[PDB]
């Protein structure tokens, strides 16, 4: 797992973890309310840059505009989206009953240090699957470009040579609201 900070927001830490061979996505979704984490569908996340750009947008929105959803975790799922409809974002970017991978995201607002051992214990009690490193090498395994193009409404004329090129277009969509 990785624990990170956005430079202009030193007191907010975000933990990100990536799981493969996930067996209980349906169960996770059923219990989601009554757990706080966001469970994100990696088929729509092609890079760290994309994910971190949404985390940035989340903090900007909440600090300087308005929070639309329940907490930072859900707000970030919204901010990953190209559109303003909350339900659509949760549906498209949240895990699905058939998800075999997931990103587990959590904002930590307490100024204190994140308790990493407890955090890992909590995640593994929720997720039946195998954690792998949250990095671009592993994210490049699971993103679905075709689905991404459809969801982010990218034209067939747009033909990025590599993942960096694709990531740039998604960050654009994220930053523009």
């Amino acid at each position: 797992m990785v624990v990170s900070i956005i430079p202009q927001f030193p007191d907010i830490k975000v933990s990100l973890a990536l799981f493969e061979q996930v067996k209980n996505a349906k169960e996770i979704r059923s219990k989601m309310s009554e757990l706080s984490f966001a469970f994100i569908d990696p088929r729509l996340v092609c890079s760290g840059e994309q994910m971190y750009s949404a985390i940035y947008k989340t903090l900007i929105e909440v600090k300087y505009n308005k929070m639309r959803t329940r907490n930072l975790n859900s707000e970030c799922v919204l901010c990953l989206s190209p559109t303003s409809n909350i339900s659509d974002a949760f549906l498209k970017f949240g895990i699905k009953d058939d998800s075999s991978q997931l990103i587990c995201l959590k904002f930590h607002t307490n100024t204190d240090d994140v308790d990493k051992e407890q955090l890992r214990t909590i995640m593994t009690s929720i997720v039946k699957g195998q954690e792998i490193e949250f990095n671009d090498d592993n994210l490049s395994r699971f993103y679905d470009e075709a689905l991404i193009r459809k969801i982010y409404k990218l034209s067939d004329d747009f033909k990025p040579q590599d993942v960096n090129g694709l990531s740039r277009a998604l960050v654009d969509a994220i930053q523009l609201r």
């Binding site: 430079p7 202009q8 930053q175």
Partner: protein, 238 residues
């Protein structure tokens, strides 16, 4: 004052160095959201404007157009007026300055008749041709708003500063864009200024001529208007 508010907004975590004031432009070595050492570039641009929305939307749209070279939009805070951009260009050797078109031209002004200069200027015209073919206007097309990015022994022109940019299929807007650049290049009073403009126009025309019969027609329209703009751009006894 402006430096106070900006450094407070960014916090001491983010280093800044002012490079232009008016709407202040800074450079920073700090990526706005990738974990430290997980980014891929030495520095970035921060534009602060207490146009922000306009430039961001246009940068995003233009990136998706094949062949158009513009800075990456990295981050946008429209509530406070900040945009973070990819830093394009570099210092020319021998203290000739930042690698915008203006400085490149000055550096080569004593001996401009080379493949490097001609090819580079044609590439500048290609960028403007792509922009206009796709019905966008720059709005402030000076030699300072065209940045050369080194590519080995070659230079790759990029367009920057889209604060006044717009979507437009009007040949009048296209003609004025071309005229602004033409006059900016002529402004140096260089004995070679007309040649520079000719190389640029060659690049522009090639883009249109690559679009078959439709391109040739639209090019005739644009060039006709451009000449009218030139006529209307100089004193006449009405």
């Amino acid at each position: 004052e402006f430096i106070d508010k900006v450094s407070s907004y960014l916090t001491p975590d983010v280093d800044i160095a002012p490079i232009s004031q008016g709407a202040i432009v800074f450079t920073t070595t700090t990526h706005p959201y990738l974990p430290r050492a997980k980014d891929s570039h030495q520095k970035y641009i921060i534009k602060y404007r207490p146009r922000t929305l306009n430039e961001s939307r246009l940068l995003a749209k233009l990136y998706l157009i094949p062949g158009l070279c513009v800075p990456q939009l990295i981050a946008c805070d429209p509530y406070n007026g900040f945009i973070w951009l990819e830093f394009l260009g570099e210092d020319l050797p021998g203290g000739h300055g930042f690698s915008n078109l203006k400085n490149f031209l000055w550096m080569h002004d004593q001996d401009p008749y080379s493949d490097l200069v001609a090819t580079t200027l044609r590439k500048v015209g290609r960028q403007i041709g792509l922009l206009h073919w796709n019905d966008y206007c720059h709005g402030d097309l000076t030699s300072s708003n065209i940045v050369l990015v080194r590519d080995g022994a070659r230079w790759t022109p990029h367009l920057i500063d889209f604060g006044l940019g717009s979507v437009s299929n009007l040949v009048e807007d296209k003609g004025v864009d071309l005229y602004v650049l033409e006059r900016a290049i002529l402004s140096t009073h260089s004995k070679h200024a007309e040649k520079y403009n000719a190389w640029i126009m060659e690049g522009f025309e090639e883009v249109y001529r690559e679009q078959g019969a439709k391109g040739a027609k639209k090019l005739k329209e644009v060039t006709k208007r451009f000449e009218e703009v030139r006529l209307r751009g100089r004193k006449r006894s009405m």
